[PDB]
Amino acid sequence: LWVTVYYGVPVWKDAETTLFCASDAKRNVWATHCCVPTDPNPQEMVLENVTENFNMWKNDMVEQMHEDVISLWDQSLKPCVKLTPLCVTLECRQVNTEEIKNCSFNATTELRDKKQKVYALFYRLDIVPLEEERKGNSSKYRLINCNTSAITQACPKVTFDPIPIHYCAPAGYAILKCNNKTFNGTGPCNNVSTVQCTHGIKPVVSTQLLLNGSLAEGEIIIRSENLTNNVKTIIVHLNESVEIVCTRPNNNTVKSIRIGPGQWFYYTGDIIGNIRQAYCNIKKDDWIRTLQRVGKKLAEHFPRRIINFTQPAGGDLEITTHSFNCRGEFFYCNTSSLFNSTYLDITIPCRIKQIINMWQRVGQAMYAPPIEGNITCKSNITGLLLVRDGGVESNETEIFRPGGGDMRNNWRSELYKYKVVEIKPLGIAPTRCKRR
Amino acid sequence: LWVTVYYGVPVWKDAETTLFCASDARNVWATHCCVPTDPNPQEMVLENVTENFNMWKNDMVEQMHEDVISLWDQSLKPCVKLTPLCVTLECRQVNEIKNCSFNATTELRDKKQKVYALFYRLDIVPLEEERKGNSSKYRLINCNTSAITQACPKVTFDPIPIHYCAPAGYAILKCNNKTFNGTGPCNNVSTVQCTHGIKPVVSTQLLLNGSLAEGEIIIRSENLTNNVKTIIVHLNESVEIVCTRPNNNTVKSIRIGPGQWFYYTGDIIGNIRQAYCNIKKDDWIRTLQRVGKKLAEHFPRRIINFTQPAGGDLEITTHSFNCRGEFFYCNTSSLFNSTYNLDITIPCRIKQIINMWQRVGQAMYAPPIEGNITCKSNITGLLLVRDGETEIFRPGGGDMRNNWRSELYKYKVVEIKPLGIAPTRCKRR
Amino acid sequence: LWVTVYYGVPVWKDAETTLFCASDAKARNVWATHCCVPTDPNPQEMVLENVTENFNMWKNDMVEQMHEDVISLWDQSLKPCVKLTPLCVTLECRQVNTEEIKNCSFNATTELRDKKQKVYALFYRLDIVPLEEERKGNSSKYRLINCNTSAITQACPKVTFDPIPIHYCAPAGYAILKCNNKTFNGTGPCNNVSTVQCTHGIKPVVSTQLLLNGSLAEGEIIIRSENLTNNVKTIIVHLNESVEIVCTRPNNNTVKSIRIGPGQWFYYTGDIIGNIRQAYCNIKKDDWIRTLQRVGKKLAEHFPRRIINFTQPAGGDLEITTHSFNCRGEFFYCNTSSLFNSTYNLDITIPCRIKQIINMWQRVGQAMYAPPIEGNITCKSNITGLLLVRDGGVESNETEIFRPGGGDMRNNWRSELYKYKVVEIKPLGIAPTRCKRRV
Amino acid sequence: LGAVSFGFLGAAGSTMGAASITLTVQARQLLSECQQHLLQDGHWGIKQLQTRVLAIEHYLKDQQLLGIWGCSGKLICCTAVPWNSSWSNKSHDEIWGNMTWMQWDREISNYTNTIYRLLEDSQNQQEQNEKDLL
Amino acid sequence: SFGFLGAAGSTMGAASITLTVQARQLLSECQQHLLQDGHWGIKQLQTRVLAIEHYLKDQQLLGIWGCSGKLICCTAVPWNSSWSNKSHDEIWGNMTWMQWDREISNYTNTIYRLLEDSQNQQEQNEKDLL
Amino acid sequence: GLGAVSFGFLGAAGSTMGAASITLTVQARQLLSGECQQHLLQDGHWGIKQLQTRVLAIEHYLKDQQLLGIWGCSGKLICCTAVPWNSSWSNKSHDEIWGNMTWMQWDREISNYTNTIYRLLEDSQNQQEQNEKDLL
Numbered sequence A: 001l002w003v004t005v006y007y008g009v010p011v012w013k014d015a016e017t018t019l020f021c022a023s024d025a026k027r028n029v030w031a032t033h034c035c036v037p038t039d040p041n042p043q044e045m046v047l048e049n050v051t052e053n054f055n056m057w058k059n060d061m062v063e064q065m066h067e068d069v070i071s072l073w074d075q076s077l078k079p080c081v082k083l084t085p086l087c088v089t090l091e092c093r094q095v096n097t098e099e100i101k102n103c104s105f106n107a108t109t110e111l112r113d114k115k116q117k118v119y120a121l122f123y124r125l126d127i128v129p130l131e132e133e134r135k136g137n138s139s140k141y142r143l144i145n146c147n148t149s150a151i152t153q154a155c156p157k158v159t160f161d162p163i164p165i166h167y168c169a170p171a172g173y174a175i176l177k178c179n180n181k182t183f184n185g186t187g188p189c190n191n192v193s194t195v196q197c198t199h200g201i202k203p204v205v206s207t208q209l210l211l212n213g214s215l216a217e218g219e220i221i222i223r224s225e226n227l228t229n230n231v232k233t234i235i236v237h238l239n240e241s242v243e244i245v246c247t248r249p250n251n252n253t254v255k256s257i258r259i260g261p262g263q264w265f266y267y268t269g270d271i272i273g274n275i276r277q278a279y280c281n282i283k284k285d286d287w288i289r290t291l292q293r294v295g296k297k298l299a300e301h302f303p304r305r306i307i308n309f310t311q312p313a314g315g316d317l318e319i320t321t322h323s324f325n326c327r328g329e330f331f332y333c334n335t336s337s338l339f340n341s342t343y344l345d346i347t348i349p350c351r352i353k354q355i356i357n358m359w360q361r362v363g364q365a366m367y368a369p370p371i372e373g374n375i376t377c378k379s380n381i382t383g384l385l386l387v388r389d390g391g392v393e394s395n396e397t398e399i400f401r402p403g404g405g406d407m408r409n410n411w412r413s414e415l416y417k418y419k420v421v422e423i424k425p426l427g428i429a430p431t432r433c434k435r436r
Numbered sequence B: 001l002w003v004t005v006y007y008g009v010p011v012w013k014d015a016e017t018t019l020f021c022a023s024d025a026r027n028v029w030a031t032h033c034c035v036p037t038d039p040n041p042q043e044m045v046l047e048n049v050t051e052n053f054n055m056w057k058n059d060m061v062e063q064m065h066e067d068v069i070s071l072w073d074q075s076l077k078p079c080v081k082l083t084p085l086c087v088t089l090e091c092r093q094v095n096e097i098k099n100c101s102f103n104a105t106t107e108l109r110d111k112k113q114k115v116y117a118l119f120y121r122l123d124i125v126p127l128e129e130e131r132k133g134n135s136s137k138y139r140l141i142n143c144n145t146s147a148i149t150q151a152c153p154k155v156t157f158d159p160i161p162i163h164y165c166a167p168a169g170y171a172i173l174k175c176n177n178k179t180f181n182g183t184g185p186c187n188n189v190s191t192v193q194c195t196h197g198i199k200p201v202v203s204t205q206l207l208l209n210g211s212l213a214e215g216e217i218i219i220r221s222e223n224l225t226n227n228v229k230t231i232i233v234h235l236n237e238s239v240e241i242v243c244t245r246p247n248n249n250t251v252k253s254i255r256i257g258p259g260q261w262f263y264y265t266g267d268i269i270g271n272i273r274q275a276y277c278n279i280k281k282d283d284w285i286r287t288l289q290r291v292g293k294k295l296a297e298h299f300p301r302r303i304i305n306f307t308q309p310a311g312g313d314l315e316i317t318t319h320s321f322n323c324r325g326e327f328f329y330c331n332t333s334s335l336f337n338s339t340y341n342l343d344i345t346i347p348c349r350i351k352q353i354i355n356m357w358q359r360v361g362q363a364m365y366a367p368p369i370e371g372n373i374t375c376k377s378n379i380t381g382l383l384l385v386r387d388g389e390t391e392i393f394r395p396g397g398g399d400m401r402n403n404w405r406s407e408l409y410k411y412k413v414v415e416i417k418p419l420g421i422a423p424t425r426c427k428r429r
Numbered sequence C: 001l002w003v004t005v006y007y008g009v010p011v012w013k014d015a016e017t018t019l020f021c022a023s024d025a026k027a028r029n030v031w032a033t034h035c036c037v038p039t040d041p042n043p044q045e046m047v048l049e050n051v052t053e054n055f056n057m058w059k060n061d062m063v064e065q066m067h068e069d070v071i072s073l074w075d076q077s078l079k080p081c082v083k084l085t086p087l088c089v090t091l092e093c094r095q096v097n098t099e100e101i102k103n104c105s106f107n108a109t110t111e112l113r114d115k116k117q118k119v120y121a122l123f124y125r126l127d128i129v130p131l132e133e134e135r136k137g138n139s140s141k142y143r144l145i146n147c148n149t150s151a152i153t154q155a156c157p158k159v160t161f162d163p164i165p166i167h168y169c170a171p172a173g174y175a176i177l178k179c180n181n182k183t184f185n186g187t188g189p190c191n192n193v194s195t196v197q198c199t200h201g202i203k204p205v206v207s208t209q210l211l212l213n214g215s216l217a218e219g220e221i222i223i224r225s226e227n228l229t230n231n232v233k234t235i236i237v238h239l240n241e242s243v244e245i246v247c248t249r250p251n252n253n254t255v256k257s258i259r260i261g262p263g264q265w266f267y268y269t270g271d272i273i274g275n276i277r278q279a280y281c282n283i284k285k286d287d288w289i290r291t292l293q294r295v296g297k298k299l300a301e302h303f304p305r306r307i308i309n310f311t312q313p314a315g316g317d318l319e320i321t322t323h324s325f326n327c328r329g330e331f332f333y334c335n336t337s338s339l340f341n342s343t344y345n346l347d348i349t350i351p352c353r354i355k356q357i358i359n360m361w362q363r364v365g366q367a368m369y370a371p372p373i374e375g376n377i378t379c380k381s382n383i384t385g386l387l388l389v390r391d392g393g394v395e396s397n398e399t400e401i402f403r404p405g406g407g408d409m410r411n412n413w414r415s416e417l418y419k420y421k422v423v424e425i426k427p428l429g430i431a432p433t434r435c436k437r438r439v
Numbered sequence D: 001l002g003a004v005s006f007g008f009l010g011a012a013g014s015t016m017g018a019a020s021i022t023l024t025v026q027a028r029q030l031l032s033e034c035q036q037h038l039l040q041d042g043h044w045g046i047k048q049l050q051t052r053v054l055a056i057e058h059y060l061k062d063q064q065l066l067g068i069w070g071c072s073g074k075l076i077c078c079t080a081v082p083w084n085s086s087w088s089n090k091s092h093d094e095i096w097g098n099m100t101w102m103q104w105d106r107e108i109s110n111y112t113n114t115i116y117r118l119l120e121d122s123q124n125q126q127e128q129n130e131k132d133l134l
Numbered sequence E: 001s002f003g004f005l006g007a008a009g010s011t012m013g014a015a016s017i018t019l020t021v022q023a024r025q026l027l028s029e030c031q032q033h034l035l036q037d038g039h040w041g042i043k044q045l046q047t048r049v050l051a052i053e054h055y056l057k058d059q060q061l062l063g064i065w066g067c068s069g070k071l072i073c074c075t076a077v078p079w080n081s082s083w084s085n086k087s088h089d090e091i092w093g094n095m096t097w098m099q100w101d102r103e104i105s106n107y108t109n110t111i112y113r114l115l116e117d118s119q120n121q122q123e124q125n126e127k128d129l130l
Numbered sequence F: 001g002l003g004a005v006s007f008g009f010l011g012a013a014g015s016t017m018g019a020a021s022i023t024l025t026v027q028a029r030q031l032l033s034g035e036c037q038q039h040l041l042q043d044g045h046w047g048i049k050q051l052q053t054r055v056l057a058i059e060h061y062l063k064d065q066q067l068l069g070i071w072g073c074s075g076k077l078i079c080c081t082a083v084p085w086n087s088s089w090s091n092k093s094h095d096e097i098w099g100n101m102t103w104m105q106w107d108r109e110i111s112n113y114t115n116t117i118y119r120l121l122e123d124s125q126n127q128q129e130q131n132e133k134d135l136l
């Protein structure tokens, strides 16, 4: 009958706003930043009888996480030693004991009128030849990416270990979480709740397998923006983890030199014992059951087709191998022996690189210093990134090849259940009471 | 009888603030000036309102000056530095342009490369006596003063119209009185949110683009009888000037460091020719007859002599402009050679190392463009300086504020004061 | 009887806030460039009658803010100045004929990258580290000190670091309380508290053992320490009458300069016109003796039944054993062992060394080069307080040993900020009254 | 700070009546170092200030509207504008008993500006009536 | 507040009538780039913060006088012929708000002090009615 | 500045509450009403520090105004309420509280009950709001 103005109305609208990062209480990164302590025993308020429309794609939380991860990485590397002085001709020979070469070069010193003779072991993947090789007992080589840009040494005192972080809404905004399991990433969610902060998300970097993530509450869930369109990447969320143990079985002796005032350069000096290839061991029975279950779930979406898991097409290691950071070492593992089926460990050969072009940004190379001794780490495989071949012609089959690309499909694997909304407390309604 | 407090009173006070840049919806002017402007923008004429405007002491000009310099420097900052090229050059005759060889750096610190490049004599400073035969040693100009930064070849500075917009709480008053000089009352004032489109064109003697006077030619000066002030002449009709560099340049590039590409002129395919401008002769003559007449009105019982500028540094005696990224220094002495009671060809010099904004150091290097260069400008005004029965007026300039002031002369920024008090007949009770 | 809400209640709570700096409006000076906000003439000060407030000289956030501001201003002032990395070259040095100053030669860079220039310069031995065993009369090889640790930045000769009074001012909503009790020991209650908008003028003078150009005590000499029993803590003797100290570098230097690169000039000492003399300071003898006797008396009162023995600092690096200070841009390191030579409750000449490469605040990795000044240097200061460190331990012969302190710049600034506290105004309060709102 | 507490939500799943009866009961109770790295060490210093500044502007804008409508200082305020069946012809009991605030907000979103203009005019008339009490 | 200046030069009386209705109605990816480029973000924040501070100062001032929530508010302070000796027929006719503002620009503090004293008396009376 | 931000509101500290209140009622209105642009807030972090200070001052001002609004005290400096005083909060007599006692001592004495009192004030206003709705 009459208009009444109400303030505090439980209504919200979709909005894009900056969300601060908060980490659990008690050097590093992901802790120096994200310092804000989280609440102990955080609250979640379930909204009864509330259905909301969620879309894990076009989720601004992913773009913010992407930019924060890149920005923090670059800020961490900024105050570190530049390796521009080392873009010199290298004279490399076979290591006395061809993945690793013994390279001699003339490095700078703190005095600009003096140079020093340095011997170092480098991986072949970090070196580009200038001359035909196998001439005499040595040949001239250049560091990879020297022509493209400067190489910055990561600070050896700062670690990038992916501790969990939480994203929190600023006052006036709220984060809605989708509680319903089996949600495919788009459309309505019939069980939602309101939270202030997200759960703890580990900023783990990988290209084919998703490591140390969350497990599905129920069954394996296949999420893709458009399964028909083979351009889009399919994210597979597992309900059980598969254990993978990776190692670099080489007892390295690490040496360091000064290359300018206060500028220390770290490199591998020698290897004690013989030289062995890095590798990963993935439990065979868990992998086989996992792949059979994924094949089953894909069959439900691609009926009357053979589900063929195959290797990636040949190309640069960055787009064909499983990449990961194991205690600062960068592994590039050849997973063609895993995706070899058609619906006691499996050993995966791995290559190691020290000069890394992260996030497909050409022009900002980083050098990862070596760690003495041998490296071993263990992780939980919690999901997969698959790309459907999508050829128009096939003998009633569908081929699913491992593919990653954007790290942005890794962060979508954790943020798919969250939406950020703005509270709109002012509204009107009819009443029977006149102002008079 | 009783005091009443009103909120929302249409009263304003003169105030300074920070205006934001907007433009009509790469180019540094398009990267900046991010806010889209409205199509068909609002202008609200204030009836029976007289306001005092002053073209000089206008903070919008100082802001535009600072914003242009800041944007320019931010645009050049992430670009290739040419410090590695401060080496001895060995220069020989090609057959004003010399064929100079030098040992440039490479991506490897233990290797150098031999580079042959053509440089203009104005960019080269001798180290020893210059011989007609053999070769002589020289260095790049300004090497002993500052590092030289190469402009990024993929970033263009070509001016586009921009609009300055008031923040909320402020308004811009525009003087709509035609044939209005500065320092005085304006009897036709309208309120706008943003200025009209202004092109940040850089020139030293002629104003090569912009708005034309709605009325007759207007002579504006802070103190016309003071011979140390610059006189800004706004024309009501433009004069077409076509400038060109008739040199079929072949551009080569080398790396001088990791990811650091250096661009230089490699060769000239045809004949070596001097750059020049052609300004329509009849339009220029009518323009100066009209300017001379107005100056005679301002300086009665005097002869008006338009002469060439006095000798001095090239940057302050020639007409400088940016034509597709190339910097022309045209000797406009043939244009100011007359006394008041088809084309005129002006020779031009080209420079690659530019000291902008009258600063010492922070030199910029302009990469060459392949082929020949042409551009066409509409001369809209003149910057004249009086020497102080014959008055002598010479081209002059170089203080960039005068170019931007020539567009902002009609705008004032004011602050809205919504409170006011007046007597009423009604008591609070 | 009924709750009544009052807004504007004269109540405050301790709070931290960023303060802003202000200075005299009437004027290169880094401190004048910063602290640009003019202060008021005849500033407001109000006395709070019958107000007792607990002050604590230690754990005063105004000191931490002043410390960070001083460091930030120094680091910013050197940001655009010439870097001396190109001068880390083998340097060949011989003794100057008519140990402390050597005639060194080196091949410096030039405007062009393919040319070098031969440069001769005089350097102090304290700025040079040998590379090979030295030989008298021969061109031994040396390098500049701190070259291996980090880059050396030349201070800009146009930039002036001379201390001026500055004032720290509270932002709106906060007030600075000042203790006006002339005998306040730095902690505990103060029964005469006034409120100010800004502190008095404080000169950011940098010194290691003696406090120069500070305020004088209103009363007698005041001995302040966080804990006198704990001999680890530094004591800050404030003095009620200054002692005049005159310092000089009696060397008529000729200063030369070269270019290092485009637009980058390097300044160095070219020659000495006259003889070579050691720098020195002179402190009036009678004023020093009376001052030290009065300090000994106060310490004896604080440490009864003990002999107060003042001795020299234990041996170590000059930065922690000598009285360092900046005299018109040059850095003096004066040996004060001849002053702290008393036993118990005409001038005195102090030898001084001079250095050009300074590691300010003992921060390893950020060295600066102090350009030379032509002619000879004189300056004079007022000694207003001492930094003393007690050596207890065994307490041999029932004595206490006091030595010069220093090494932590916050003790110098605390010596001026000890009387100020920053509080937040809390204007909203509740009290019972006899009035109720109508239903 | 405004109506920004999380406890303002949860009533979204209740009907307008049931949620309304929570206002004036809970609404007032709901209304009620490492910082040198997050700030002054990157562009985060600006992003955080923009968020804080933006939140203030939104708060003030909502308060301004309450001022304009004559609703300042209240959580529920009745006006003198009659309800038009053109905006919504659902019965009072149907709106309050069988709808949530979210669905209601959607149903009349296209008339919100119209209603707001009427509120302004109503207050305008009331202000004149106060002046006319002379 | 841009449209408020449309009433400029309206003899005040007309301007007052115009504001009576119009003032209430008047009161009611690339852009982010420059916020991280140089110091443009700081200048924009200074502009927004200053605008907020001036708005709040005006609202505080209206609150002090007891005019909060109103657009036009009558007080209990009588007009003094010293401040202006013009009649109400001249002030509200053949005179604009700019001219009036100049006319009493130097009496603002006297009027404000009287308004503050009047509000103190009113608030007291309100306390006394209880 | 904004709000009760002046030394005139800080003076009278140490003075009896009754006298400070009397001063308040005749001074608060008068007190409430009352190349740095190139070096500072450019090329340094003074910009952020001052903006944080100004924004924080604004937030504190608005917070206090919100509290006065919620309690129904908007536009007043001394607002009477309808919440009875509980002897469990303070058992001192009216004269002892208003005489021979300063605002600092009073604030310390009831600090532990401040939030309880605030909750009651909020509840009181809700009852008053219902009465306004009912008497129509």
Ligand SMILES: *[C@@H]1O[C@H](CO)[C@@H](O[C@@H]2O[C@H](CO)[C@@H](O[C@@H]3O[C@H](CO[C@H]4O[C@H](CO)[C@@H](O)[C@H](O)[C@@H]4O)[C@@H](O)[C@H](O[C@H]4O[C@H](CO)[C@@H](O)[C@H](O)[C@@H]4O)[C@@H]3O)[C@H](O)[C@H]2NC(C)=O)[C@H](O)[C@H]1NC(C)=O
Binding pocket: A027, A159, A161, A162, A204, A205, A211, A212, A324, A325, A326, A327, A328, A376, A377, A378, A379, A380
């Ligand atoms: C998925 O999650 C797992 C579990 O977190 C990750 O694997 C762990 O990774 C961390 C960090 O890379 C490993 O921690 C490192 O262990 C080294 C060996 O530890 C031995 O010695 C310590 C001595 O205290 C014993 O406590 C320990 O039990 C072992 O006996 C340490 O030497 C490392 O310390 C070094 O780095 C830290 C970094 O801050 C420095 O502070 C130290 O001073 C020192 O320099 C480090 O603590 C951990 O061992 C791994 N666990 C397992 C089971 O492998 C996976 O990496 C993750 N997945 C991905 C893809 O990242």
Ligand SMILES: *[C@@H]1O[C@H](CO)[C@@H](O[C@@H]2O[C@H](CO)[C@@H](O[C@@H]3O[C@H](CO[C@H]4O[C@H](CO)[C@@H](O)[C@H](O)[C@@H]4O)[C@@H](O)[C@H](O[C@H]4O[C@H](CO)[C@@H](O)[C@H](O)[C@@H]4O)[C@@H]3O)[C@H](O)[C@H]2NC(C)=O)[C@H](O)[C@H]1NC(C)=O
Binding pocket: C028, C029, C160, C162, C163, C205, C206, C212, C213, C325, C326, C327, C328, C329, C378, C379, C380, C381, C382
């Ligand atoms: C404790 O406080 C005292 C007093 O404030 C300080 O001593 C003063 O320090 C300043 C700065 O070092 C001295 O000022 C300098 O004086 C030089 C000239 O001195 C004589 O010579 C000229 C003739 O050449 C006479 O006209 C003059 O009156 C003096 O008799 C100046 O040349 C210096 O100028 C340099 O710096 C300025 C800075 O702006 C530049 O503009 C100049 O171009 C030039 O580079 C300088 O002004 C002052 O003389 C000292 N006073 C006394 C009595 O000695 C103490 O230093 C201070 N204690 C500490 C520890 O700092």
Ligand SMILES: *[C@@H]1O[C@H](CO)[C@@H](O[C@@H]2O[C@H](CO)[C@@H](O)[C@H](O)[C@H]2NC(C)=O)[C@H](O)[C@H]1NC(C)=O
Binding pocket: A044, A046, A179, A180, A191, A192, A193
């Ligand atoms: C909707 O989701 C919520 C949260 O996921 C469910 O509530 C949980 O229920 C389990 C019991 O199965 C409890 O152990 C948890 O503690 C509950 N969590 C919370 C936050 O309440 C709720 O049961 C779901 N409802 C439906 C119908 O799916």
Ligand SMILES: *[C@@H]1O[C@H](CO)[C@@H](O[C@@H]2O[C@H](CO)[C@@H](O)[C@H](O)[C@H]2NC(C)=O)[C@H](O)[C@H]1NC(C)=O
Binding pocket: B181, B182, B183, B184, B185, B220, B221, B222, B223, B224
């Ligand atoms: C610009 O126009 C103004 C008039 O609006 C001129 O100002 C005055 O003009 C009268 C003649 O009408 C002179 O007697 C005064 O001396 C002028 N005053 C000043 C301060 O100059 C003004 O002279 C004009 N300026 C120019 C350069 O033409």
Ligand SMILES: *[C@@H]1O[C@H](CO)[C@@H](O[C@@H]2O[C@H](CO)[C@@H](O)[C@H](O)[C@H]2NC(C)=O)[C@H](O)[C@H]1NC(C)=O
Binding pocket: C213, C214, C242, C381, C382
């Ligand atoms: C050192 O102390 C002396 C006094 O002991 C100061 O000399 C006085 O300074 C004031 C200026 O503040 C003059 O008005 C007096 O006339 C001076 N008296 C004498 C005897 O010189 C001196 O200024 C102090 N120096 C410093 C740097 O603080």
Ligand SMILES: *[C@@H]1O[C@H](CO)[C@@H](O[C@@H]2O[C@H](CO)[C@@H](O)[C@H](O)[C@H]2NC(C)=O)[C@H](O)[C@H]1NC(C)=O
Binding pocket: C218, C219, C220, C221, C240, C241, C294, C297
């Ligand atoms: C500074 O303090 C000392 C004491 O610490 C004062 O010295 C006293 O001066 C009186 C003057 O008549 C003598 O009778 C005392 O014997 C002195 N005491 C000592 C221990 O020597 C000195 O006068 C004070 N000076 C100022 C300016 O306050």
Ligand SMILES: *[C@@H]1O[C@H](CO)[C@@H](O)[C@H](O)[C@H]1NC(C)=O
Binding pocket: A226, A227, A228, A229
């Ligand atoms: C998926 O992509 C195909 C491309 O062939 C398109 O035709 C189809 O409509 C897309 N599906 C959706 C739901 O957009």
Ligand SMILES: *[C@@H]1O[C@H](CO)[C@@H](O)[C@H](O)[C@H]1NC(C)=O
Binding pocket: A247, A248, A249, A250, A374, A375
């Ligand atoms: C790695 O080093 C550890 C050190 O204890 C050793 O136990 C382990 O066997 C090593 N692994 C390999 C593959 O050498």
Ligand SMILES: *[C@@H]1O[C@H](CO)[C@@H](O)[C@H](O)[C@H]1NC(C)=O
Binding pocket: C185, C186, C187, C188, C189, C224, C225, C226, C227, C228
């Ligand atoms: C300062 O005086 C107080 C007495 O008010 C005393 O408790 C405290 O210990 C003294 N501190 C020092 C350092 O003398």
Ligand SMILES: *[C@@H]1O[C@H](CO)[C@@H](O)[C@H](O)[C@H]1NC(C)=O
Binding pocket: C227, C228, C229, C230
């Ligand atoms: C001062 O130091 C002594 C050292 O023995 C210690 O016992 C005493 O507790 C300290 N004083 C305070 C107040 O902590």
Ligand SMILES: *[C@@H]1O[C@H](CO)[C@@H](O)[C@H](O)[C@H]1NC(C)=O
Binding pocket: D085, D086, D087, D088, D089, D090
């Ligand atoms: C009014 O009721 C009719 C049903 O007769 C319905 O179609 C229409 O949408 C209603 N209008 C509104 C504004 O709810």
Ligand SMILES: *[C@@H]1O[C@H](CO)[C@@H](O)[C@H](O)[C@H]1NC(C)=O
Binding pocket: E080, E081, E082
């Ligand atoms: C103005 O008011 C004062 C008192 O506030 C009075 O004394 C004075 O006479 C008044 N002016 C005139 C012209 O009456």
Ligand SMILES: *[C@@H]1O[C@H](CO)[C@@H](O)[C@H](O)[C@H]1NC(C)=O
Binding pocket: C049, C050, F012, F014, F015, F016
């Ligand atoms: C302080 O106490 C004295 C004596 O009790 C009294 O006269 C004086 O007025 C008090 N201070 C104030 C501000 O009232």
